[PDB]
């Protein structure tokens, strides 16, 4: 009797090397960003994502740098923002994204969420049952559930 999978390589696993992998990999986003709304973290791995877009912008171009700013800063960096991240808006970055933006300013405030989770979500996601859910069809060599699908409470 086989043992495992022979179709790819280990991918459910490779989200325990490192961060890069999480990310880099479609399946270790679908179930990570999942797990964050079982506590209405989604904020979290929100923002960051709107950061890499916002960083890959240019300086010169501003028209794109200034929408993006503005949009993602009243979105979680605000005043009355739905829901702020952990980060602060101490920065004074506003009266800067506001007139002028930065495509690497942004780069110290997105690292701050990567760690953040990266040893908060990141850490608690292999913790729970939700990820060994893909880890049994790894070692096993069944396939992988839905997250989704995954009821938010625990048995």
Known sequence: GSSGSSGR???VASWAVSFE????DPVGVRYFSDFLRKEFSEENILFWQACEYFNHVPAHDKKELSYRAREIFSKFLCSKATT???IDSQAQLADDVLRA??????KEQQLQIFNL???????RFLK?????ECILAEVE???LPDSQQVPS???
């Open 21 to 24: 992998r999480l990310l880099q």
């Open 117 to 123: 989770m990266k040893f908060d979500s990141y850490t």
């Open 141 to 143: 060599g069944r396939a």
């Open 84 to 86: 702020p991240v952990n």
């Open 101 to 106: 933006p930065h495509p690497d300013m942004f």
């Open 153 to 155: 409470s625990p048995a």
């Open 9 to 11: 390589e280990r991918r």
């Open 128 to 132: 729970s049952p939700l990820y060994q």
